[PDB]
Amino acid sequence: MGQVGRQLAIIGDDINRRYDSEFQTMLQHLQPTAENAYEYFTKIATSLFESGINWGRVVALLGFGYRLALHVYQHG
Amino acid sequence: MGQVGRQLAIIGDDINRRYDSEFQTMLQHLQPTAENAYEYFTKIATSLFESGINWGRVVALLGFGYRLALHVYQ
């Protein structure tokens, strides 16, 4: 339990360090606003899952959406 | 774009390859059943976040929980 919790922390911190900078760049090429962010996310979800759905892709979309939310906060 | 959906698939498929086998190993060392999955998850969750919380840890917990549910379903 406590040991697996720490291993999840290592995986979690690993996910952060690997892809967080990749999301920032994906948001720059996007240039989203407070009026296209929801439709962009919804269309991106359909486009992603059309080629297949797995837990990694769901987890990638959730992290991207959270980073999308932060980007629209900071540059809106 | 629909162009971004294709790059998320690459990240998503990479996330699956990178950690799915590690999630399997952590689960078969933990050996959970239906009678104990909920308490194990909720204690694993709090202990994880009391060391710090960021979006990677949140999604790692979500993916772990999904594979946890799959392990108990056997």
Swiss-Prot record, chain A:
Name of the featured protein: Bcl-2 homologous antagonist/killer
Function: Plays a role in the mitochondrial apoptotic process. Upon arrival of cell death signals, promotes mitochondrial outer membrane (MOM) permeabilization by oligomerizing to form pores within the MOM. This releases apoptogenic factors into the cytosol, including cytochrome c, promoting the activation of caspase 9 which in turn processes and activates the effector caspases.
Top-level taxonomy: Eukaryota, Metazoa, Chordata, Craniata, Vertebrata
Motif (BH3): 4-18
Protein's cellular compartments: Mitochondrion outer membrane
Sequence motif BH1, location on chain: 47-66
Subunit structure: Homodimer. Formation of the homodimer is zinc-dependent. Forms heterodimers with BCL2 and BCL2L1 isoform Bcl-X(L). Forms heterooligomers with BAX. Interacts with BCL2A1. Interacts with RTL10/BOP. Interacts with VDAC1. Interacts with GIMAP3/IAN4 and GIMAP5/IAN5.
Family, as annotated: Belongs to the Bcl-2 family.
Tissue specificity annotation: Expressed in a wide variety of tissues, with highest levels in the heart and skeletal muscle.
Domain remarks in the Swiss-Prot or TrEMBL record: Intact BH3 motif is required by BIK, BID, BAK, BAD and BAX for their pro-apoptotic activity and for their interaction with anti-apoptotic members of the Bcl-2 family.
SS bonds (residue pairs): none
